Curated annotation (Swiss-Prot), chain A:
This is Hexon protein. Signal peptide: none annotated. Belongs to the adenoviridae hexon protein family. Major capsid protein that self-associates to form 240 hexon trimers, each in the shape of a hexagon, building most of the pseudo T=25 capsid. Assembled into trimeric units with the help of the chaperone shutoff protein. Transported by pre-protein VI to the nucleus where it associates with other structural proteins to form an empty capsid. Might be involved, through its interaction with host dyneins, in the intracellular microtubule-dependent transport of incoming viral capsid to the nucleus. The chain holds residues 854 to 903 of 952 of the full protein.
Curated annotation (Swiss-Prot), chain B:
It comes from the Viruses. Belongs to the adenoviridae hexon-linking protein IIIa family. Cleaved near the C-terminus by the viral protease during virion maturation to form the mature protein. Residues 14-24 have a biased composition (Polar residues). Residues 1-24 are annotated as: Disordered. It is found in: Virion; Host nucleus. This is Pre-hexon-linking protein IIIa. Interacts with hexon proteins; this interaction tethers the peripentonal hexons to hexons situated in the facet. Interacts with the penton protein (via N-terminus). Interacts with packaging protein 3; this interaction is required to promote correct genome packaging. The lineage of its organism: Viruses, Varidnaviria, Bamfordvirae, Preplasmiviricota, Tectiliviricetes. Its main location: virion. The chain holds residues 1 to 303 of 585 of the full protein.
Length: 50, 303
């Protein structure tokens, strides 16, 4: 019984947080990452939008 | 080479103040390290991470007042533990009882004294530690009480005792450590070892006051000198490694037996060097050689 179809692929992903690091490399090495206390993000004031 | 008692003002500093880098106290040591001036590796400050790099600059260029009281008050209380002014389990109370005392009086002239007393109390540990090695202090004062109470220079029989006066004084000066002239009971007595396996009375010595000068028979234990108590006999063998020449070796046993007490020591140190060899050669004998002690018995009996 040959029928025609186009599939729908989707991911499931629960019970973990969407974690992204804070460096120019973007890889968490230690606790304080490169951009965490760098030249640009150290003592100056900045305001995160989204 | 060895140390004095681990410095009491420093032991308490060891447990309180920073170890590696005290940026205010070791200011020109951190300043030498940050200026790339250190001879180990100059750029040890350059290759370090940037954040702790800044922590060294902020702390050294502007010196921050670190807390000094708890390494000064503890310096007294740990010296109180080494001088034994307090017990080791008392370190919880006296540390804070005086901190609560300076909580009430933080700010009088008393704490200006306290740090001068710190240098005094730490020196008192060093003074007493050198003084307990010479236990003469709790010995000469005790001998002063012995010399005053006991009638001195009264041998109206025959006099050889003038030499013996210095003989007891030589025991205080030569060996001082465990040599304490304890006055527990009214009879004076001297201990020689740390555990006191020959502590006889110096008032058992009062048996010798009538025997300061009597007639000598011949060379075998005398017909009269059997009266000398093993108590007083223990003293006269103990003064024997101190004084030899002076007391007449031909007039009474004060000298003849004192020369014979050297015969007991003279055999002992020879047999000591004899025993240290036969026991050492146990690979070639392969037996419990009590003949090392049996020959020692034979070298004392068959003479």
């Amino acid at each position: 019984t040959a029928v025609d179809s186009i599939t729908q692929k989707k991911f499931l992903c629960d019970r973990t947080l969407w974690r992204i690091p804070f460096s120019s490399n973007f890889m968490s090495m230690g606790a304080l990452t490169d951009l965490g206390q760098n030249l640009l993000y150290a003592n100056s004031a900045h305001a995160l939008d989204m | 080479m060895m140390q004095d008692a681990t410095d009491p003002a420093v032991r308490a500093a060891l447990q309180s103040q920073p170890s590696g880098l005290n940026s205010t106290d070791d200011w020109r040591q951190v300043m030498d390290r940050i200026m790339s001036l250190t001879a180990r590796n100059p750029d040890a400050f350059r290759q370090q991470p940037q954040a702790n790099r800044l922590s060294a600059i902020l702390e050294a260029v502007v010196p921050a007042r670190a807390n000094p009281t708890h390494e000064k008050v503890l310096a007294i209380v740990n010296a109180l533990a080494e001088n034994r002014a307090i017990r080791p389990d008392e370190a919880g109370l006296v540390y804070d009882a005086l901190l609560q005392r300076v909580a009430r009086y933080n700010s009088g002239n008393v704490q200006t004294n306290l740090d001068r007393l710190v240098g005094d109390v730490r020196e008192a540990v060093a003074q007493r530690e050198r003084a307990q090695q010479q236990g003469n202090l709790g010995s000469m004062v005790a001998l002063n009480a012995f010399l005053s109470t006991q009638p001195a220079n009264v041998p109206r029989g025959q006099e050889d005792y003038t030499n013996f006066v210095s003989a007891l004084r030589l025991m205080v000066t030569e060996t001082p450590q465990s040599e304490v002239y304890q006055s527990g009971p009214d009879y004076f007595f001297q201990t020689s070892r740390q555990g006191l396996q020959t502590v006889n009375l110096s008032q058992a010595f009062k048996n010798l006051q009538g025997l300061w000068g009597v007639r000598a028979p011949t060379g075998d234990r005398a017909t009269v000198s059997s009266l000398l108590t093993p108590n007083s006999r223990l003293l006269l063998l103990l003064i024997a490694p101190f004084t030899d020449s002076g007391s007449v070796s031909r007039d009474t046993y004060l000298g003849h037996l004192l020369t014979l007490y050297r015969e007991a020591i003279g055999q002992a140190h020879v047999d000591e060097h004899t025993f240290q060899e036969i026991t050492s050669v146990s690979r070639a004998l392969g037996q419990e050689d009590t003949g090392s002690l049996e020959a020692t018995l034979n070298y004392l009996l068959t003479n």
